[PDB]
Write a protein that binds this ligand. Structure first.
Ligand SMILES: NC(=O)c1ccc[n+]([C@@H]2O[C@H](COP(=O)([O-])OP(=O)(O)OC[C@H]3O[C@@H](n4cnc5c(N)ncnc54)[C@H](O)[C@@H]3O)[C@@H](O)[C@H]2O)c1
Ligand SMILES: NC(=O)c1ccc[n+]([C@@H]2O[C@H](COP(=O)([O-])OP(=O)(O)OC[C@H]3O[C@@H](n4cnc5c(N)ncnc54)[C@H](O)[C@@H]3O)[C@@H](O)[C@H]2O)c1
Ligand SMILES: c1cc2c(cc1Cn1cnc3cc4c(cc31)CCCC4)OCO2
Ligand SMILES: c1cc2c(cc1Cn1cnc3cc4c(cc31)CCCC4)OCO2
Ligand code: NA
Lengths: 259, 259
């Protein structure tokens, strides 16, 4: 496996639909040793889910909390000497930030929270993980969405937070590259995960994507997972600060034949 | 290997410094079956170079010629039933198009030739290779450079041609995706190959890149090769119309500390 021996922390595993589930399968297949995090209530759920991946640790981490993030690396440092990669697969905005007119729905607090959990959290993991990752061709990868680059209906505050995430990825790439750490993002096409559960006509975004994309299909968690896996391998050591679209080519087309 | 059994055509192999050499090593390591093209004079040189990769064919192809491109796929169809990938690693502009002031140096003919060989040729290969590539998760990959996105000193007409190449990649991605063919480009940082031989002070572009990039190094042909290889695998089936920068992160920074 091209990840044989590498010690990789995966955040955001919540169901077998999670993008993080696909990341896990791909990394496990490629011989990575895996650790996982969960937010408080979901301890048992997550422990069952990642059992199949022989995890070295399954640890709490609510990225709202500086203390929990700090404690995550203290506990992880007890099982591993160094850390090869961090996979960030976490987003949150309050429900009201996510449908209807952007300007009608945006609030100061909703905007704050979405950025806090969706963007700042990446730099926070970077900040606390840094010393374990020093000088071993380490990697970070964040999950992002094209709503960062374009105004889209509904995505609203999450789009703005994603834009802040991608910039964070670039500044993190600049800040960590001297320690040999590469820092990148994967822009996934829409996938029906628990993140989709709030959103009405999500299935419609999905059908639209399959209709307009060059490849005439929807991506799945394995396509995303495989790419994240690649971005954590010695094969990708020349790539940093990059956003790789795994979206069946949605990002490169405008309009199409079916208007 | 993640390319086991895949039949891949590689153009542009000219010395053991060629980016195509790195692509070949990476694909051979991953179990691909390889074929190679050469331009007229270099038959013996190329045959010697790619012998180590146990090539199924080593065939002439000067992309100036529609006939040669057509004959390439006729001959290749005699040894393979289908084709899994085409690697485009070819560029040319007349020497005079490549140093000094863009406007002083650009000529109608030099502009024409650079686009013909550096950009049009990609669609030409696509056009003639299409029927062998139908419905097998096939791949195309072109080599490009950031001079396509930004005005740079010296790169001049090649910059413009690369910009035409990248648009070609996107329209080719749109045109071929219904056949399941993914079409992408790898944007390499500067590498001292025979393409560098005309360019005085190439070593300084190289030193500048290593100073200013997040990773504080120059990419090599294996970093590029490994990425091209990935982009031809079943792991990348969700990626098309994309440009992946393999450039130690050069692309994501502005200014840096050392002015
Ligand atoms: N589903 C899609 O259509 C799609 C498209 C593009 C990008 N993404 C991104 O992929 C990532 C994974 O999302 P998903 O689609 O697998 O959905 P998901 O609901 O399974 O994953 C989101 C994860 O974020 C976690 N999370 C929320 N608040 C957290 C906090 N405070 N601390 C730690 N974790 C927290 C949730 O527990 C969950 O595990 C997100 O960045 C999402 O924006 C998803
Ligand atoms: N070397 C760099 O600094 C760097 C950076 C970014 C992108 N690239 C790109 O990589 C590709 C490979 O170039 P390289 O740098 O390994 O140099 P190279 O000189 O090894 O390869 C260029 C290839 O293009 C071929 N070529 C020229 N005219 C041709 C024609 N008419 N028909 C068929 N082939 C023809 C040459 O024979 C040669 O094999 C090019 O697209 C180049 O622009 C190189
Ligand atoms: C995809 C595309 C969309 C969308 C929702 C999606 C799916 N999606 C992608 N990243 C997400 C991040 C979040 C959510 C959903 C997300 C739910 C709340 C937590 C943050 O709404 C409009 O267009
Ligand atoms: C890189 C950066 C440069 C450059 C040259 C480079 C290196 N390079 C990359 N693609 C190429 C394509 C071509 C040439 C050189 C190429 C020479 C003529 C054939 C086409 O000139 C100014 O800045
Ligand atoms: Na706290």
């Amino acid at each position: 496996g091209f990840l044989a021996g590498k010690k990789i922390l995966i955040t955001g595993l919540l169901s077998n639909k999670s993008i993080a589930y696909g990341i896990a399968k791909a990394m496990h297949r490629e011989g990575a040793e895996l650790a996982f995090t969960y937010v408080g209530q979901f301890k048992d759920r997550v422990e069952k889910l990642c059992a199949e991946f022989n995890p070295a640790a399954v640890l709490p981490c609510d990225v709202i909390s500086d203390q929990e993030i700090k404690d995550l690396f203290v506990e992880l440092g007890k099982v591993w000497d160094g850390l090869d990669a961090i996979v960030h697969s976490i987003a949150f905005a309050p429900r009201d930030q996510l449908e209807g007119n952007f300007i009608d729905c945006v609030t100061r607090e909703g905007f704050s929270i979405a950025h806090d959990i969706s963007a700042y959290s990446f730099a926070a993991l970077a900040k606390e993980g840094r010393s374990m990752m020093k000088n071993r061709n380490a990697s970070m990868v964040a999950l992002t969405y094209i709503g960062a680059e374009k105004a889209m209906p509904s995505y609203n505050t999450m789009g703005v937070a994603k834009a802040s995430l991608e910039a964070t990825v670039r500044y993190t790439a600049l800040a960590l590259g001297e320690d040999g750490i590469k820092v990148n993002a994967v822009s996934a096409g829409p996938i029906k995960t628990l993140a989709a559960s709030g959103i009405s006509n999500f299935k419609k975004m999905l059908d639209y994507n399959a209709m307009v994309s060059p490849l005439k299909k929807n991506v799945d968690i394995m396509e995303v997972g495989n790419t994240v896996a690649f971005l954590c391998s010695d094969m990708a050591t020349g790539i940093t600060g990059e956003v790789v679209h795994v979206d069946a080519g949605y990002h490169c087309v405008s309009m199409g034949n079916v208007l």
